[PDB]
Amino acid sequence: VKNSIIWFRKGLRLHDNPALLEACKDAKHVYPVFVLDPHFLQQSSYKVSVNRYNFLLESLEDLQRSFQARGSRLLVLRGKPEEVFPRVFREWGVTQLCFEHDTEPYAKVRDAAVRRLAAEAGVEVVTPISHTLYDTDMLVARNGGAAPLTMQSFTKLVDRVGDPPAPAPDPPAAMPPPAEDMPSAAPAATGVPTWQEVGFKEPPLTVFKGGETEALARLEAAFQDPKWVAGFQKPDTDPSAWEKPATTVLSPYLKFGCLSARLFHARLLEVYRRHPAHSQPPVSLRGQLLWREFFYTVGSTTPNFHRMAGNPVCKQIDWDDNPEFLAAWREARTGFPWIDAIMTQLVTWGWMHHLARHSVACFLTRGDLYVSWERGMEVFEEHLIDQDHYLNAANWMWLSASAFFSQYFRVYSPVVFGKKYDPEGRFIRKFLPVLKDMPAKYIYEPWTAPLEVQRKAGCVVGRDYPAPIVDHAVASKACIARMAAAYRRSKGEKLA
DNA sequence: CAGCGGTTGCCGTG
DNA sequence: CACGGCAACCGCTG
Ligand SMILES: Cc1cc2nc3c(=O)[nH]c(=O)nc-3n(C[C@H](O)[C@H](O)[C@H](O)COP(=O)(O)OP(=O)(O)OC[C@H]3O[C@@H](n4cnc5c(N)ncnc54)[C@H](O)[C@@H]3O)c2cc1C
Ligand SMILES: [Cl-]
Ligand SMILES: [Mg+2]
Ligand SMILES: [Mg+2]
């Protein structure tokens, strides 16, 4: 007899789920599992937004629905995997455990443990690749032992390898339920809790909802206009667009695996086949899926990837320890509306357009504050609903000119940048209510408004909104000089 | 045995 | 529409 568990971590979907399909073959009972640490939020050292947490829960609710509609259901087991699995293996009489492979530093530790624990209860463990497009261990082997370090050579490499695998077949229409009278599988014990029930006091303000169904819905919303998909160029999108965001906002879905990377890709190749004049990497929409892939690939094969020290791809830079600047940046009180609006959108939505991420990330690091990119990653990690270990680390290294990118004099202006997309300040007005009546002339630089305009608007600097914490021209030049010196030093160490 | 090309800056100038 | 400045970048290509 075959009794299996299909363990969800990422890959919160039924489509393109090889791990699910293998867990269903010749099976008497399948137990769909999500393991939930109930004492997660009480581990003081790191914080998590109710926005990210609830997005997960909404996705788990979407899975529960998908399984009820096929006879089975989702089991939200409470505890730590290394505790929970040993019991339910023995209890449920488990022969097989299937999950989607996960290349993150922590997931490898966790999965090494669960594999050992499976062996000690006679449990077979099958873990297909399906979160990334390719098997990244393969991509590295094919390149000769090391992950590419430029996108140009990465694009060649995947062209050589060929198209990523197709999305897997849709799963069974009806599924074997779990065996009845198993106390760990009791519906009173295994329900999907609400944000209230896990101990959050403030409600989630985000406009994007979790779940496979939303994910596929938003996928169809994107392919509504195949002209747009074919002609997509990432640098030409608008970071001020909030009502109709100027990119797909598939990132939260791809992060949790509500959407299948391979499906999205497969759908792009269909469109590109019918529109031969389509955009190419690195700017194309496929290019964006390959950016994700490129950073998973390098990130997963690089020691200490999410830190500066001991990271072989990362420039060693003299970043200042500066809590007042960091705290101001974090708390959306830098006194530059463009920045503060973005960092407020971060907190209230958990998503901003990439160029808005560029604005605030540059400003923290080499642009203005000279604070370590690690501190910025930590803030994003707390708030982003699409927060992804490797992509966040990689992009923070990119924007601080620490890896992948080294033209550090290309500093974004916190005044001018968004001004050219949104000169009325509709984004600033949306996310900084306090400036809602400040005339457009001064909305990006309210310290330049004369005191009468401030009082009329209902927004006096130093009272209703903070004064800018630095002079951009002085500070950005100060930082450039520091980066130049830091590059000279690591040029001198290199000859050794 | 040294170039080619790079997802997303900006200002002052002519 | 395009340069020089910032200050001298760098991995990949046989
Ligand atoms: C400092 C910083 C931190 C970031 N942190 C994250 C993060 O934690 N998680 C995250 O998913 N993205 C991150 N990004 C990348 C990018 O900002 C988002 O992936 C993108 O804005 C999401 O919108 P979208 O899905 O509409 O992208 P689209 O332009 O529609 O692209 C489609 C998909 O391609 C992938 N993609 C797009 N841009 C990038 C990129 N620069 N790097 C890697 N993959 C990409 C995403 O999975 C995305 O859903 C970060 C960028 C910066 C500068
Ligand atoms: Cl130039
Ligand atoms: Mg060239
Ligand atoms: Mg000028």
Do the Cβ atoms of A226 and A272 come closer than 8 Å? Answer: no
Domain A1-130 CATH assignment equals 3.40.50.620: yes
What resolution in angstroms, rounded to 1 decimal? 2.9
Question: Phi, psi (5° rounding) for residue A135?
Answer: -70, 115
Query: What's the CA gap between A366 and A376, in Å, rounded?
Result: 12
First vs last Cα of chain A: how many Å apart? 62
Do the Cβ atoms of A300 and A103 come closer than 8 Å? Answer: yes
Question: Phi, psi (5° rounding) for residue A482?
Answer: -65, -40
DSSP A94-147: --EEEE----SHHHHHHHHHHHHHHHTTT-EEE----SSSS-HHHHHHHHTSS-
Instruction: Quickly name the fold that domain A303-488 has.
Output: DNA Cyclobutane Dipyrimidine Photolyase, subunit A; domain 3 (1.10.579)
- SS3 assignment, position A234: helix
User: Cα of A367 to ligand 2 centre, how many Å?
Assistant: 19
Ligand 1 pocket, CB under 6 A = A 234, 247-251, 254-255, 288-289, 291-292, 295, 353-354, 357-358, 361, 380, 384, 386-388, 391-392, 395-396, 399
Alpha-carbon distances of A191 from A63, A72, A97, A328, A406, rounded to whole Å: 12, 13, 21, 40, 49
> In sequence order, what are the beta bridge partners of A99?
A7
Could you tell me which of A262, A268, A305, A314 has the C-alpha nearest to residue A391? A305
Whose CA is closest to atom 31 on ligand 1?
A288
CA angle (A336 as vertex; A331, A340 as ends), nearest 5: 35
Annotated domain spans of chain A = 1-130, 131-167+212-302, 303-488
Residue A365 is given by DSSP the state: I
Question: Phi, psi (5° rounding) for residue A249?
Answer: 45, 45
Query: What's the CA gap between A234 and A264, in Å, rounded?
Result: 16
Domain A131-167+212-302 CATH assignment equals 1.25.40.80: yes
Q: What is the residue whose two structure tokens read 């039924």?
A: A14
Do the Cβ atoms of A339 and A329 come closer than 8 Å? Answer: yes
Q: Solved by what technique? A: X-ray
Q: What single letter denotes the amino acid at residue A181?
A: D
